[PDB]
């Protein structure tokens, strides 16, 4: 254990990187990109405010991190009080669930690329991946996953738009823009199937 | 004598201040940037001055991880309350933006999505109308009262927490859409019929229609339609506020 | 103060907007419909020649009825700002 | 007031049915410090007057105590003002 | 001014001590004058009198403001001298030393009050 | 009464809270919020260089709070300066006219809510309301009144943009931004209908009514 | 009668705190800065010349416009005060005259009337009876109104160019192009071929 | 308390499983309290800044 | 002046008919109080240095210290007022 | 006549305070910065080069352009002052001359006349005696006009590219295809092929 | 010859302020983020990944790219500094050389020649004698040109997709259908199936070599 | 808790310095009283004792004041320190062992050590406000 004043300095300094922790280490990027792509899908880039989407992504991130938060509480929050383990060793033990999660959600190709970017040859085991190699690989994997989910969301709305345009063309209309007609049908399909709750359920299942 | 125990007063006045200020920074109308920061801070300070002496004082030291957990808890409660309240205005904004987009007011989004050219002026109109209605129905007083009341349900002291409850707030994201359609279902429908009518005109002699006759007619029709539809939002406004409030009451516990 | 007053002022506001925008929109619509029916009669179809007279007609519309719009909107705003301290709650 | 006495009897009825603050503490501290200073000053003036029984030892010691109490009050005011300035700088 | 009311008592006491000091030193200096009576003032009564006026009114700038402009008690003789001098060395030497001490005490008290009023303001 | 050192200390300390009095106990708050909202409405988030709006708000507040300040001076400051009323009673005497102004403008619902939150007994008349209840009730009422005034202010400046966008859309110019066209017209409106005299008079009446 | 030198130093060094307030509310800085901000908005680009350049240029323009008033103040107040011929208070009272005349010359009657109504003023009489605390807010209100009047007519030619370009582009057929993107270079061309900066400074100076 | 003694026996089961005032005091507590209040203010400021940075995003 | 006498008769008519705080006026009155206190102490020191009888050294020192206390009062009030004004004017609407 | 050392260092620090204003209103920083901003707007990429990169480039270009003036100031003014040969007042007066000459070289006579007539200056014989208070605003205005001229001229090739791609898309019947998406890559290609960055910086340097 | 401790601390803390400037004008960062700023434009979603995510990803990529340069600086210069075998001046002189070499290898000769001519520098015998005042802006210019080249090349497959989709839409008589919204999901498809992000970062890292 | 524990040693040492100076002043006051043995405390042992087990008092018993009109009164509240006797230097007929040289040397030494404690505690508290200063 080192000095209390140094501990305060380090704690307040690490408090600054909270957006970095939320974005790079948790899943927040995935939900935020999925929400952005879904908003782009419905054809209305300002229908729900950016604030509301950010808060919804924050709540989803909190739930989906609740198991990792519980593991942190068991391994770090509690034993730091009983003083069986404390300080930097307890900090590393508490960060261990974050690795496990980020190893689970990271693809092998990104980790391989970032290892050969750091000349880390003897990285043989999969539970001893350094943070420098694990973090950007995890972010890239999250970007790929979010884009895939966005395309899957895109498919039904694209189908509806194409169907509306095809019926307009077949009915004889050649000048009517299909977007105006298809927008309320997109909304009625989204509400009627209750798209939002199934979307959140799938995102939670998507881990 | 001349004690004036400072730690007791600090611990009594801090955590209620944290929760009240966390609600203030996110609750609608109380979180608008037009208010000077010092006014918000003073309102939080005075509300805490009124409330805190009745509450049981906590004794956890500010120099402990327990204090950090407490601060996180207060921030979570405040932002959850404020955001759940904000959901109703989000729904009203959605309905207004969709009415405006079916007006053809901003056609550049269909061709250039998110191209720095968008003006949901109807969304702003009904957003500020909703804010005026919320001010009239004294929703903010209720918010403050419920912020106070969540103590009896959830005391300052660290208490265990649940899960699907968070989903509920996240699942409230559905309401913004669902209720939004409930505000746009009549007018858009008639607009739809109007567009259908325009289609019948285009089934006649080719071209020479749409983009030249459809836009002004549909713009004027949307204007007078939803001008007549304005008296309708107020019952729906109260319905939205009641939905948000009882969802908050049920799920916060 | 009452919600009836709020909805009444909103409705009157947006009827003022309708009165402000109706001459220009109606003139543009009439010009477009006339040019379209002339195209149908003559069997001429280019999507650009309907855009030409519309601008001229709508711009003339401000020449003729512009002062009326400017006087109506100013009167509305003046009355609203004068009655502001009596609808306070 | 007549209505004020009505309110007093109403609060008494409230007590029947049912069956200090930081500003108050600061006011009490200020009153105590001022009372000590006034007592020391009055004793000093009495000694300067020539009245019997007042010893220079007690006068000087009481002036010393009053000065210490004044300095304590000044320090408390300084900190309190500093804490208020710190809070009013808090971001909301 | 309220500042005067706080410092009025000590200033008047200090001035009265200086005046009585001058009177006692005059008694010492005139010890050898035959027929000189030793005079003194009653400190407490005169302090009451000073502690317990009308500046003429100035209508304009040229108008000139009002221009400003204690009772001595004989000492009871102890020994009868032949030349009529009633000044006693021992009594007035003790009174002189006492007045010096009290003047120093008044200076100390007044300085302490001013220093307290100052540290209240410094910041 | 307190010693002169204590009185000077209290006076110097109380001189600190002047911004708090201006913001939470004075007309300044609902004299600003309206200015910020109006600046947001015209589309020029800088235009009157702030400082200008702050000076105008200060002068308006000074002109509006004049009778309250006069009553405080005649009832509290004058007897205190003439050594007739002690320092600890001048504050209590002068806090009453400000409290009355704070009531003339503070709505009820807020008073009932903050009377309930303090668990205080029934308040049969306004004479039983303490400052601990009136302060935040007055603050909330002022915030709500300012926001109401600003939100009815906002309507014409959005109406103009709506009609501008509709007119642009009639002719097919769908790629023309409406804000750039509407800003000169909003400035023209605010010039024509005495933009500031009407707003100044409306705010001043809003206080004295 | 004269103030002590310590009092004079205290008042003099305290008065320097109101220098930005004097420059903003009481001088020509407000109108020029508002017109400059409106002109950037009207140019089609919101931050082409940095705020620093515009602020310095507005300061220089304000100094050049107010130089006669500064000279009158120096002759009437500063010079006879520094030579120890008049007191500080009388020097301030004498020096407030040319600035009062400058503020009055650009003050709207309605603004002064309204702010005299709100200050309980009754029989005012000569234009030389308006107090400073009444004259100042009326001057600020008149300056804001005049700046808006200048800005909304500065906006006109750029709106003309925008509308002409949009109409030509859409009537020709290319309705998918953004008219502002093509219009911005032409707005710059119009501003540079008219000598927009020089003429704008000339107009702003002549407005007084 | 009865519930307090319940808690004592619970902690014993947990152990089983595991196996007047002077200036000196016034000033020291006054300083602490100032230090703790400053720490709370700084931590809240960091949290609020992080939250506003997150919400000022662009999605 | 002729116009000055006109103003005097006008104020007399005002008194007949009759039979308003000012912050600037209050500041002027306070500054006057400080300045006359300092000038009185200075003139007393003047006369005591010149050798005029009736002036006492302790009174000179006490009056000088009173003037110093008054000026410190003024300086502290100035500091508080300037700080409050700057914090109010540094706010954004 | 020589200022005492404490006054000298007071002047030095106070002058160091005004450094950004001197950089913006006396050097070539403003014109380069305006041209860079207009160029960034012209490519359709409003935030591709970060502001800090362009600011650093403009600072380095300004230093290179003003190297002869700085050398003249060093040789003629600063070096004798550092060797105690001349006082600070005369050193500053001597150092003003090269910078003024540079500013006069890049000013327009019309703006100088406007500011001279506005300031009521008496007739001035030749460029030798023109006050800095007159020259500085005129130089700033001339720099603004020249920067706008350069930006408007630069806006031309991208306008050509946009028009030709829009016409090509329209003649194919593609009525709802926006031309910006197709034009942006070709704008980048055009700017890359002509070695745009170094060519534009060389052109900016050559104009000074 | 060594600087005093006070001067060393002053110089170190002063040079700590230039960290963003050093990162932008001396490291790889400028080429990376700019390309990202274009890539999010090519995909059709200006929102894209959030700005902070892209900035941090660029920062990590920059650190990985400059790992050899950082290691060489740590070995040659900073290690004797920590082990007291060098001064601050000599450390500053010695540690910049590997970074100067890294900057020079990505510097186009034309820009370097332009800045020489513009500084009126004498005949530079060889790369080793190039002043930093000449190498820095030339490196920034070449960096911008290379970033624009990479971005334009990136813009190609999405242009292919947009053209193909628009041609398909128009060949069927569906003239009133905006092809941007239809082609956006297919752009996302292309970026997903080919592993666009990993491929792009690998290409950037290889480009710097 | 952490901050309280970090500042507890110097705070307790400073309190014990204050109590020791009170004892030394009592010895100096009673220097001419016949039959008064000088008292003093072992600073190190008592300091360690107060740290391991918290400070305690022998008396402290005071009348309880439930109402606002109860008259407040306290008996005696002395510390739990062990008052040891100082070994006399030379004998005296009156029978006190207060040797003035020893008293004044211990007084000055305790004075400097109390000032040292104040300096250390103030330095630590600034060393902390510096961190909480952003």
Residue numbers in the entry:
A (entry chain Au): 37 to 243
B (entry chain At): 4 to 256
C (entry chain As): 1 to 89
D (entry chain A5): 3 to 21, 32 to 104
E (entry chain A0): 3 to 54, 62 to 78, 83 to 136
F (entry chain Ay): 37 to 245
G (entry chain Ax), J (entry chain Aw): 36 to 243
H (entry chain Az): 3 to 21, 65 to 104
Text taken from the publication that reported this structure:
The bacterial flagellar motor is a huge bidirectional rotary nanomachine that drives rotation of the flagellum for bacterial motility. The cytoplasmic C ring of the flagellar motor functions as the switch complex for the rotational direction switching from counterclockwise to clockwise. The basal body is made up of the LP ring, MS ring, C ring, rod and export apparatus. Here, we present two high-resolution cryo-electron microscopy structures of the C ring-containing flagellar basal body–hook complex from Salmonella Typhimurium, which are in the default counterclockwise state and in a constitutively active CheY mutant-induced clockwise state, respectively.
